[PDB]
């Protein structure tokens, strides 16, 4: 990331990756406070996903994963267009989707 | 490592010196700084010495640290033609021109390429400077609010990944709290608090500038003066 | 703090000063300051007894010596002397000698690969950074009497800030995930 | 306006120049373009001039026009680590080199935030270029077959 | 197209050329080209008399003047002299003079705020972009004789492509819905 | 090529030579070279009769005359003489006279503004760059017999390279695009 | 201020004056000034009684003695005498004696290695810097009566400016960071 810069690295992985997974909620199988405040790649990754979606190409790569209930946000709704997998129950289906 | 900074304020120079002392003592890292080699700068000149350091770092694959503050952005704007050329109180006694501006113009030719951003580490003391002070040139590269991410900075210097499959790498002494507890860390903390207090007391410090505990004896950076 | 003894060999304590007439008053005080602080200053006014035997030989004696540190006293008249002293209406002998010394300094500077090992420009009160000869601007320019501590450090050949030896490396820790 | 382009073909340079002429004369708009500004680029340098222009456009809310083409697509692939270093004849021979990469470096940091698309305009000449040549990140913004 | 007069004042037609000895022949050809095209070129080999009177004064005369444009002839030996080690300079005086001129150019460049208004690097047949001094890499690097037309335009301080004055705003038509 | 005839007036054809005994034979060869080519060379060994009437008068005749070109034959013993002739030998008369001539040349050089109009240093085969007095290093330093053609050109006051008359500015062409 | 008395032995209080007729009027006043201040001035006009016994012996008595300081009174006619006294005029015995004294001073100056230990050139009112013989331009040139106090200081062999004794090098203080 330091060599390329996050944006170029993000795009490189986006094109290179066979599959892409978006996680929108924390796990429930283990209890945590969510802490363990700074700029992150989520907004940029969302913009690149929107570009791909408007291209309507490589839609198969994108997969949405959640454990706790997804929040009520527009970006998540946009990501909802991709296949969903509730790993609390959908472990095998998600594994098959990847394979 | 080579530290590039704008001498925005004598207290800011104090902060930089404390940071260099911390790197030398607690981090075992050798620091190339203008204040420490004014003999070489006098012999060769700002541009000659700067070119030597830049070429040496690139050849040795060593990292160059950029300390961003209000002065750095002021000089960047001056280069872009949107501010009067900065004549800082601290650079007045140094050779012709400006060391930071010369260093930057020596850096920009590297940014024509898409992957030279590794050799530069962009850091700013969050308590006395804000992310808005980092030149737009370095936005493409990861930024580090110093001492809030310094452990990452030291990994960048050592060229080590902080995370790996199923395991994590940490440096005990350089961790935030351990940094605070470290001897040199206390000196850096005191200098930063002093500069922050001065900034709070004088909002227009930069315009005016424009024109403690003890380590074991002999272990830190020592300031000499004749009687 | 702590005190460090100055162990500079005496031969390195020698200093030579070049100036112009406008600065002569301040240069006298500057030499007082240097002599009081142990530096052997060689300026024409005090050397006139020996300098009078052969002026050119006297100048060449200090210009040859590599260990002698030369202090250039900048001032508005200094630039005029080192650039067009002979163009004046009358012949200023001191102006011509200053110009000759400046030429010898420049020649030595070029011979060394444009490395300024022993020329210390000093801006005197009525001087401006523009009056500094261009080639001297490539090194530290001190302003007298504002930076006299730094001038003493430079003459002693000591750095104001001295770094300690490279310290030990920190502890590296591994934490499983 | 500030126009950004890749020197794919000498004819393409003429296309850009005459498009700038059309903007100046017919559209009554002032165009900032490296070809017209080679003097200032020399005085300040590539990166400095690019930064100055980007800052001007952002400060004044003035728009930036991107002329995507085959060369832009190739340089984008090179940026993504999936393309050989493009060495177009015009850029390879000109003293300037490739300024498009510098413009990208100065532009990409913007898109970390959602509202940056307002400043930029993406354009492509349908007759000589296709919408597919547009870089992926710009793809999110509305496109215009010029 | 149509022809038009050239209106550069004669005082701005002064050009100074700095080079290394390895490019002497091509440099002479280049000076011929410039003189034939009407530019008053200053080069050491052609002005050897006034230069012989005083070399350093001669170099300073052209380095001081802001109106003079300086053309830097790049070559493998140029970077070896100006940036290379001094040990090789023990065998060449012209190398020392080129190094001094390079230092003065750097001093001017920084003094002008790191903006290159009048230093025009040129690549000669046996030269590569790697040989260009770093601070010069920040601006246009021409090649000889390939880009002699661009070099002439630059020396004339003209721009190859020039825009017309901004035209009137277009007419806007309104239609109801 | 083509042939040209120099208009050098006869009065400008006088040359004076100062040297050291370590290069007497080479200086005789050099004087042969100059006399053959039409320059009236004044040297002590040949002017013995007139020089014998009054040595100092003979030296002053050529030192006072501005039009006479003086050639300085550098060699290891020349620097030794012009530095410490009296302090190293049992009254070496030639050494003392060479030192006196050197001092007079230096005085004239300084009084002129440190500009060298008629002092031509020549390195003799056993000499080195280090043996040239520093003030003479600021001008062209020829080597004998390597540069004898250049020495002849310097004496003739003819430039080795001639630039053609400068042409007018190139006509400006405009082509719409 | 505080008063100091020179410890100059009586043997060093001898002074010899050489001049030309045009400046004899001012030379008499100069001798008055020197005598009133305790220096034993030897000049032909007062020595005429002893000088008449043997003129050449009288001149040689002062030319031999290294301890006697010779004051050269420069006037427009002095340069004329020391250059062309015998031929530029009908026999002027005083001019010939002045020329002889000048030649003897020059011979001593050359033998000593071109170092001027005891010749004091003094410009007189109708004189100018051009009238000083060149070899005398390598030392202090006083102007009468402007610099008469400096002339007295030179004769007393005292320093016009006294430097304080050199102190010890400054102890270097250390303040940790």
UniProtKB/Swiss-Prot annotation, chain A:
Annotated disulfide bonds: none
Function: Receptor for the pro-inflammatory cytokines IL17B and IL17E. May play a role in controlling the growth and/or differentiation of hematopoietic cells.
Protein name: Interleukin-17 receptor B
Coiled coil, from the record: none
Assembly with partners or alone: Interacts with DAZAP2. Interacts with TRAF3IP2.
Entry superkingdom: Eukaryota
Gene: IL17RB
UniProt domain SEFIR: residue ranges: 1-96
Organism of origin: Homo sapiens
Tissue: Expressed in several endocrine tissues, mostly in fetal and adult liver, kidney, pancreas, testis, colon, brain and small intestine; not detected in peripheral blood leukocytes, lymphoid organs, and most cell lines.
Curated annotation (Swiss-Prot), chain B:
Lineage: superkingdom: Eukaryota
Ranges where the SEFIR domain occurs: 1-155
Tissue note: Widely expressed.
Post-translational modification: Glycosylated.
Medical condition linked: Immunodeficiency 51: A primary immunodeficiency disorder with altered immune responses and impaired clearance of fungal infections, selective against Candida. It is characterized by persistent and/or recurrent infections of the skin, nails and mucous membranes caused by organisms of the genus Candida, mainly Candida albicans.
Function comment: Receptor for IL17A and IL17F, major effector cytokines of innate and adaptive immune system involved in antimicrobial host defense and maintenance of tissue integrity. Receptor for IL17A. Receptor for IL17F. Binds to IL17A with higher affinity than to IL17F. Binds IL17A and IL17F homodimers as part of a heterodimeric complex with IL17RC. Also binds heterodimers formed by IL17A and IL17F as part of a heterodimeric complex with IL17RC. (Microbial infection) Receptor for SARS coronavirus-2/SARS-CoV-2 virus protein ORF8, leading to IL17 pathway activation and an increased secretion of pro-inflammatory factors through activating NF-kappa-B signaling pathway.
Subunit structure: Forms heterodimers with IL17RC; the heterodimer binds IL17A and IL17F homodimers as well as the heterodimer formed by IL17A and IL17F. Forms complexes with 2:1 binding stoichiometry: two receptor chains for one interleukin molecule. IL17A homodimer preferentially drives the formation of IL17RA-IL17RC heterodimeric receptor complex, whereas IL17F homodimer forms predominantly complexes with IL17RC homodimer.
Name this polypeptide is given: Interleukin-17 receptor A
Source species taxonomy: Eukaryota, Metazoa, Chordata, Craniata, Vertebrata
Gene field: IL17RA
From Swiss-Prot, chains C, E, F, G:
Domain SEFIR per the UniProt entry, residue ranges: 12-153
Tissue: Widely expressed.
Outcome recorded upon mutating residue 139 to I: In CANDF8; abolishes homotypic interactions with the SEFIR domain of IL17RA, IL17RB and IL17RC; does not affect homodimerization; does not affect SEFIR-independent interactions with other proteins
Subunit description: Interacts with IKBKG/NF-kappa B essential modulator, with CHUK/IKK-alpha and with IKBKB/IKK-beta. Interacts with TRAF6; this interaction is direct. Interacts with IL17RA and IL17RC. Interacts with IL17RB.
Clinical condition linked: Psoriasis 13: A common, chronic inflammatory disease of the skin with multifactorial etiology. It is characterized by red, scaly plaques usually found on the scalp, elbows and knees. These lesions are caused by abnormal keratinocyte proliferation and infiltration of inflammatory cells into the dermis and epidermis.
Role played: E3 ubiquitin ligase that catalyzes 'Lys-63'-linked polyubiquitination of target protein, enhancing protein-protein interaction and cell signaling. Transfers ubiquitin from E2 ubiquitin-conjugating enzyme UBE2V1-UBE2N to substrate protein. Essential adapter molecule in IL17A-mediated signaling. Upon IL17A stimulation, interacts with IL17RA and IL17RC receptor chains through SEFIR domains and catalyzes 'Lys-63'-linked polyubiquitination of TRAF6, leading to TRAF6-mediated activation of NF-kappa-B and MAPkinase pathways.
Name of the protein in question: E3 ubiquitin ligase TRAF3IP2
Lineage of the organism: Eukaryota, Metazoa, Chordata, Craniata, Vertebrata
